[PDB]
Structures are given as C-alpha cells and as structure tokens.
Design an enzyme around this catalytic site. Structure first.
Site, mmCIF file in Angstrom:
data_model
loop_
_atom_site.group_PDB
_atom_site.id
_atom_site.type_symbol
_atom_site.label_atom_id
_atom_site.label_comp_id
_atom_site.label_asym_id
_atom_site.label_seq_id
_atom_site.Cartn_x
_atom_site.Cartn_y
_atom_site.Cartn_z
ATOM 1 N N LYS A 157 0.888 -1.055 -0.144
ATOM 2 C CA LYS A 157 0.055 0.020 -0.054
ATOM 3 C C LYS A 157 0.901 1.263 0.084
ATOM 4 C CE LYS A 157 -3.880 -2.278 1.207
ATOM 5 N NZ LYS A 157 -3.939 -2.825 -0.273
ATOM 6 N N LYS A 159 -2.274 1.310 -2.538
ATOM 7 C CA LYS A 159 -2.501 0.691 -4.154
ATOM 8 C C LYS A 159 -2.367 1.533 -5.246
ATOM 9 C CE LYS A 159 -6.401 -1.089 -2.724
ATOM 10 N NZ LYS A 159 -7.776 -1.556 -3.154
ATOM 11 N N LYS A 183 2.343 -8.891 -2.265
ATOM 12 C CA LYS A 183 1.032 -9.099 -2.994
ATOM 13 C C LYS A 183 0.848 -7.815 -3.975
ATOM 14 C CE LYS A 183 -3.301 -9.079 -2.712
ATOM 15 N NZ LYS A 183 -4.675 -9.180 -2.834
ATOM 16 N N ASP A 185 -1.826 -5.656 -5.483
ATOM 17 C CA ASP A 185 -3.242 -5.615 -5.057
ATOM 18 C C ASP A 185 -4.106 -5.997 -6.360
ATOM 19 O OD1 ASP A 185 -5.771 -3.321 -4.640
ATOM 20 O OD2 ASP A 185 -5.281 -4.920 -3.154
ATOM 21 N N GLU A 186 -5.312 -6.268 -6.232
ATOM 22 C CA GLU A 186 -6.156 -6.620 -7.533
ATOM 23 C C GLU A 186 -6.302 -5.449 -8.713
ATOM 24 O OE1 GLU A 186 -10.291 -6.941 -5.671
ATOM 25 O OE2 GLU A 186 -9.846 -4.959 -5.974
ATOM 26 N N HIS A 276 -7.116 -14.859 -6.603
ATOM 27 C CA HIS A 276 -7.831 -13.670 -5.631
ATOM 28 C C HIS A 276 -9.588 -13.914 -6.085
ATOM 29 C CE1 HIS A 276 -9.261 -10.364 -3.511
ATOM 30 N NE2 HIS A 276 -8.626 -9.464 -4.139
ATOM 31 N N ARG A 277 -10.313 -13.881 -5.072
ATOM 32 C CA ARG A 277 -11.631 -14.182 -5.347
ATOM 33 C C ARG A 277 -12.555 -12.642 -5.410
ATOM 34 N NH1 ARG A 277 -14.608 -15.997 0.342
ATOM 35 N NH2 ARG A 277 -13.621 -14.531 1.651
ATOM 36 N N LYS A 316 -13.185 -12.258 12.300
ATOM 37 C CA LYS A 316 -13.034 -13.207 11.313
ATOM 38 C C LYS A 316 -14.455 -13.125 10.268
ATOM 39 C CE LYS A 316 -13.798 -17.306 11.489
ATOM 40 N NZ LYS A 316 -13.613 -18.768 11.566
ATOM 41 N N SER A 360 -6.713 -13.254 5.278
ATOM 42 C CA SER A 360 -6.433 -11.963 4.903
ATOM 43 C C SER A 360 -7.262 -10.975 5.609
ATOM 44 C CB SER A 360 -6.873 -11.820 3.305
ATOM 45 O OG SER A 360 -6.154 -10.821 2.921
HETATM 46 O O1 LIG Z 1 -8.147 -1.316 9.478
HETATM 47 C C1 LIG Z 1 -6.872 -1.815 10.020
HETATM 48 O O2 LIG Z 1 -6.721 -2.396 10.933
HETATM 49 C C2 LIG Z 1 -5.585 -1.830 8.991
HETATM 50 O O3 LIG Z 1 -5.771 -0.790 8.074
HETATM 51 C C3 LIG Z 1 -4.377 -2.065 9.702
HETATM 52 O O4 LIG Z 1 -4.302 -0.947 10.529
HETATM 53 P P1 LIG Z 1 -2.935 -0.613 11.174
HETATM 54 O O5 LIG Z 1 -1.971 -0.311 9.964
HETATM 55 O O6 LIG Z 1 -3.222 0.313 12.237
HETATM 56 O O7 LIG Z 1 -2.401 -1.807 12.044
HETATM 57 C C4 LIG Z 1 -5.852 -3.206 7.939
HETATM 58 O O8 LIG Z 1 -4.696 -3.996 7.710
HETATM 59 C C5 LIG Z 1 -6.652 -2.989 6.733
HETATM 60 O O9 LIG Z 1 -7.906 -2.331 6.924
HETATM 61 C C6 LIG Z 1 -6.770 -3.974 5.904
HETATM 62 O O10 LIG Z 1 -5.607 -4.912 5.833
HETATM 63 P P2 LIG Z 1 -4.566 -4.883 4.526
HETATM 64 O O11 LIG Z 1 -4.410 -3.602 4.260
HETATM 65 O O12 LIG Z 1 -3.263 -5.219 5.240
HETATM 66 O O13 LIG Z 1 -4.878 -5.889 3.694
#
Ligand SMILES: O=C(O)[C@@](O)(COP(=O)(O)O)[C@H](O)[C@H](O)COP(=O)(O)O
Ligand SMILES: [Mg+2]
Lengths: 445, 108, 108
Positions: A157, A159, A183, A185-186, A276-277, A316, A360
C-alpha cells in the site's frame, strides 16, 4: 407437460453421476415434488414441449432426476432438493461447461422465488480429466523449503500512485524484515502511473536483494490479469524470464476459461499460481440467492491454482463451522458428510493435491493465536497494514509478526492452549524482541 | 539505536527466536513423535547452508518411540561436527512431506 | 604529470568537486526544503555502492520545515555507520522522482 417425470424417489445415483443440492422455496400452494421437479428439468433438458424432433432421442437417458426431498431445519417453506445428472451431459475437464449447464438458466425460471446452489458432488471419472492445482501444498513447500509453520504475506500500500521504483522500495522493506511473500493488489494491472514492465523489473530486484541478505527464499505475486489472453501469457512469460517463482490472477472477473489456460501454463513452466476471489460477495453473500462460496472453491480446486483467498478476518468472516467446512474441501483428499459444516455429500478427491487456505484483511498481532488455532499450518496469513502500520516502518513491522507467529507455533507444539493463553505467549515473547514489544502497545489489546 | 532495524541472516523456522533450552527440545521432539512422524538429523557447513540436501546422521529413526535416544544422538552429531548446523526434521510418510524442520545447534 | 588524466571512481552528482563544507550542506538542505521536497538519508557499504536500493535512516522526513534537525540526523547516521557512504535525497511526491541526490559523507 406437468412433470413428475423428473421426480424419481426410488432412484439410487450411480458413482458416475454429478449430484447437486439446491435450497429452494417456490410459489405458494404448489407441492414440493413439482417445484423440485421443475428444478430438475430446467437445468438439464428443460422440457417436455411437443415437437417431432424430441422423439429422435432417448430422452429418459439424458434427463436429470430429483431423488430426495428434505426439509431445511429452522424454516418451513424451504426444502432441500437433491438432483442427479448423468456424466454424459458435460465436457471432460471443462469447468466452464459444468456451471453453464447447472446455473446457466434455472435461476431465471419464474416459479422459484428463491434458489441457492449449496453443494456439488463431482465423480472420480470427472475429476481425473481436469488439470487441478499446478503444484499443490506439498510441492510448494518443497520448492520454497518452508516447513512446520504457516506462511506470511503482505499487500503493498498505497494501491494507487507509486512508481515502479517506489513500489520495489516498499516490497524490499517488508521482505527483508521477516515476511516471505508480498502481493500485488487486485487493481494493479498496467495503469498510466506505473506500467507493468516497470513494476515487474524493479520488484525482481527487491526480491532478489532480500533473498540474498536474509538467506531465505522470498517472492511477490505479480498480477498477470489482463484484458486479453495474449496479454496475460505475455506477462506470465516476462515474470518467468525474470526468474520469479509465483504470479497471481483473478478468476471470477477474468473467467474460468482464462484461469484454466493459465493454470496449465504453470505446469509446463513450473510456476505457482495465487488466486484472488474478487467480486465474490456479489454472488455468494446473501443466504437465499446465488451460489455458496463452497461450490466456487471446488471448481477452483478443479481448475487450478495453489492458493485461494478465503479471508477475511475482522475479527473473522464468521460461523466458524461453515468456514472449517470448505477449508476441509480445499485441503483434504476425502471429506465425509457432515451437516454442521454444511457438507451434504461425501467427497473424494483421490490423489489431487490440496490448495493453501489464505486468510486476509485486517489481521493484527493479537489475532495470531486465533488464526493459528483455527487454520493450522497449511495457511497463508496476509496483512495489509499489519506490517506497514508499525511506528518504526515496514521492516520492523514484519519483524514483529514473524516473532509472534513463531511464538504461537512453538507453544502449540508444546501442548499449550494458544487461543486461551494468548497474552503470556506474547508478553513473554516481547521480552526478547523490542520490535514486538512496541507492536503490542499500539494495537492494544 | 531506535528505530533502525538491521537485516539479519536467519535459517528459517524459529530463527527469529533465541536458541532453545534443553527442555524446549524435549517438547518439540515429543510433539514430533506424538504425531507419528519420523525424526531425522542433518548438518552442513554454515557456508553450504542453502544447499538443497544437507547431510544425514545417520539414518532416519523409523519407528522410534523414545525421546531419550534422540537427545543423545544430537550431541553426537554436534561433537562429531562442532562447526556445523544441526537440524531436526520430522518425516511424514503418508504425505511425503516434513511436519517439522528447525535448527537446534547453530554451529560453533 | 601533465597531461595524463587518470580515471577516478566517483559516486555521481557533485562527485568531481571537493567534499562539501558544513555551510554548503546548509544551503543544499535549505534549497531542498524550499522546493517542497522531502529529505531522506541513506547509507551503504562502499562495496555495495551500485545496489539499486541503499539503506534508509530512518524514515523520510515528511513535512519537515527545519534544517537544524537534518544536520544533526546526518551525524547520527555517520556515527552509527562510520564506514558507510551517507547520501542526501529530496523526494518529490507529485512527480514520483528525486529532485536532489548527492553523497554528503564519503565513508571513513
Ligand atoms: O483497518 C486496519 O486495522 C488495517 O488498516 C491495519 O491497521 P494498522 O496499520 O493500524 O495496523 C488493516 O490492515 C486494513 O484495514 C486492511 O488490511 P490490509 O491492508 O493489510 O490488507
Ligand atoms: Mg482484526
């Protein structure tokens, strides 16, 4: 034309049949046998009309029949319709054909208000015609030399915006700090601000310079989704020529035809495939309409791909029994029938390799003991901001997850309860690492 | 200095954690045996550390149900090769894979 | 001897000129900040000098308007790594490019 020529309660499905489960409820008043018979008809022969031509054929052989009616527990107007299809209706090793036949038309048919494809039993005669995963779990662990623990990943990131060189700058930092995958990103395809031959080449340097400094094998799933199949193969062959181990593709938006052509290109060339789905929640999410994600996981294991997103971890996707149900089907070789996990059929895969279960979306350091107890070792854990969101950077962030993962494993082996003693499996780990000791203070608690 | 993270060369699993105590080796070995796997000892010169095949010692302990022998077969490989890494492996015969793989002794 | 020109190994920019005075570093830093760029410090072992990515220190100074901090964050990287080159960079966020890039300390 009134059916109940497709309602055979005495039929015993062959071992070559293709079974299916539909959770259905039809118009008010019509009996269940008629409305499940209509689902039997409209998904196979869609008849009888009255033609001279429909007598040139033995149509009692190609007809699909409904052999069992069962009631949904907790609902009254709904029912389960189990329908059997002869093996001759489908093309060999074609998953584009098995869905076009089944879900191609019945969903528009008017007598059904609600219809959901829940499960499919594939026969061993059909499974052996399909390509399957290009490598699998046990071959991926061989080629990468990673044993005894789940794999770790990160999604780069921002993205949108980074040049080909700044991208590789951030890829280099997460890899050199403890992760083993990154990874694309899509969205990242070949945008004006970052063409793909510039991203592919500077990543190849960030991966090769972190593999030598750590002494471990590292990778980055490069997105080879394109607008044409000639373009997709071109990116795949660029990535293999740069010496890269793994790539990526979007099978729901790019189609099963492209996904299967890529999946068999990976076997002749010895590459790994990550799936990726995207656009899954459009179909799979609502509990009475569309297809369950379980069925799109079986079709993926049949078409190819060694890893597949299952998500989604905040905290989850949620029940756990439903998720553990089709994680079994992605990984195991024989899965019995259990209604709690929503397996309606006994499914045998024979000797077809399994697929990694990727968790993820929003994991942080306190989620490790719950994601090691639930998923096991043949899993990938991919955070987006879990690595990057650390006060000291992207290398100190990766160094905190790799310490908290290896502390949760070594406590699972030694007989402890990880998902229950999580705080002393972590605070006693931060005593020997100042990178984790500060990560535990941020994402409290 | 904080916070300047330095890239460190590691083996692979359990590499980011401090070296294991004798009591920790006990429990990892006991877990390896309780899953039904076969223990296996390897070693290399730390320079050949990225070879695809390390060196055996001596043959995999097929069907061994006693962890008091493996803790003594680990000091033998170490004393015989005091400048080698000493790895511990757990062979899975049904999956043809490895359920465990962690360096025990680091190479004096 | 004149005139026998000997090829000399240089870094890149400002390499043909003598090492900069403390007062020269002031004005280059002030120019870098007055264009709106972000300062960034790097270092490598002089043998790895042709790597594509040097090593950060510690994070780019996003939105820093004071040059009395960067002249003190340059002696820190130097004292912590007294055998490294110490580069000074100026990040341009709108063009995704570098408006400045010159080695300050040469590596004792
Ligand atoms: O909402 C959150 O908690 C995060 O931003 C982490 O915050 P922090 O950086 O403060 O830990 C998540 O990683 C993203 O939302 C999605 O995950 P990713 O981008 O890894 O796919
Ligand atoms: Mg969370």
């Amino acid at each position: 034309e009134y059916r109940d020529t497709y309602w055979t309660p005495d039929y015993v499905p062959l071992d070559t049949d293709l079974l299916a489960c539909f959770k259905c409820t039809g118009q008010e008043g019509v009996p269940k046998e008629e409305v499940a018979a209509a689902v039997a008809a409209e998904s196979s022969t869609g008849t009888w009309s009255t033609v001279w031509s429909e007598l040139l054929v033995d149509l009692d052989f190609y007809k699909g029949r409904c052999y069992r009616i069962e009631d949904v527990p907790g609902d009254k107007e709904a029912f389960y319709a189990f329908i059997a299809y002869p093996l001759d209706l489908f093309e060999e090793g074609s998953v584009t054909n098995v869905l076009t036949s089944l879900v191609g038309n019945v969903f528009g048919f008017k007598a059904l208000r609600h219809l959901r494809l829940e499960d499919i039993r594939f026969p061993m005669a059909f499974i052996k015609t399909c390509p399957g995963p290009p490598n699998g779990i046990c071959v991926e662990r061989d080629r990468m030399n990673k044993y005894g623990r789940p794999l770790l990943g990160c999604t780069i990131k921002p993205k949108l915006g980074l040049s080909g060189k700044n991208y590789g700058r951030v890829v280099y930092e997460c890899l050199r700090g403890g992760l083993d995958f990154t990874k694309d990103d899509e969205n990242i395809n070949s945008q004006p601000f970052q063409r793909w031959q510039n991203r592919f080449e500077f990543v190849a340097e960030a991966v090769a310079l972190a593999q030598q400094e750590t002494g471990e094998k590292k990778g980055h799933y490069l997105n080879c989704t394109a607008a044409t199949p000639e373009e997709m193969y071109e990116r795949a062959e660029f990535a293999k020529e740069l010496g890269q181990p793994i790539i990526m593709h979007d099978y729901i938006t790019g189609g099963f035809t492209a996904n299967t052509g890529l999946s068999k290109w990976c076997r002749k060339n010895g590459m790994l495939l990550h799936i990726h789905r995207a656009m899954h929640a459009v179909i799979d999410r609502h509990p009475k309409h569309g297809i369950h994600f379980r069925v799109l996981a079986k079709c993926l294991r049949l078409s190819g791909g060694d890893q597949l997103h299952t998500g989604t971890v905040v905290g989850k996707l949620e029940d756990r029994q439903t998720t553990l149900g089709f994680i079994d089907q992605l990984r195991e070789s024989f899965i019995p029938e259990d209604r709690s996990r929503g397996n309606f059929f006994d499914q045998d895969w024979g000797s077809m390799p399994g697929v990694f279960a990727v968790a993820s979306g929003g994991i942080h350091v306190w989620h490790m003991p719950a994601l090691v107890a639930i998923f096991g070792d043949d899993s990938v854990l991919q955070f987006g901001g879990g690595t990057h969101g650390h006060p000291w950077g992207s290398a100190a962030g990766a160094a905190a997850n790799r310490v908290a993962l290896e502390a949760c494993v070594k406590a699972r082996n030694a007989g402890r309860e990880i998902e229950k003693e999580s705080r002393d499996i972590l605070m006693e780990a931060a005593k020997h690492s100042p990178e984790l000791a500060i990560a535990l203070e941020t994402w409290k608690e | 200095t904080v916070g300047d993270y330095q890239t460190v060369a590691t083996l692979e699993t359990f590499g980011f954690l401090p070296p294991m105590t004798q009591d920790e080796i006990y429990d990892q070995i006991a877990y390896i045996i309780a899953q039904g796997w076969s223990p296996l000892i390897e070693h290399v010169h730390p320079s050949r550390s990225m070879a695809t095949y390390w060196s055996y010692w001596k043959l995999p302990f097929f069907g061994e149900k006693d962890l008091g022998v493996i803790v003594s077969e680990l000091e033998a490989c170490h004393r015989a090769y005091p400048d080698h890494h000493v790895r511990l492996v757990g062979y899975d015969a049904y999956t043809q894979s490895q359920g465990a793989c962690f360096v025990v002794f680091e190479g004096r």
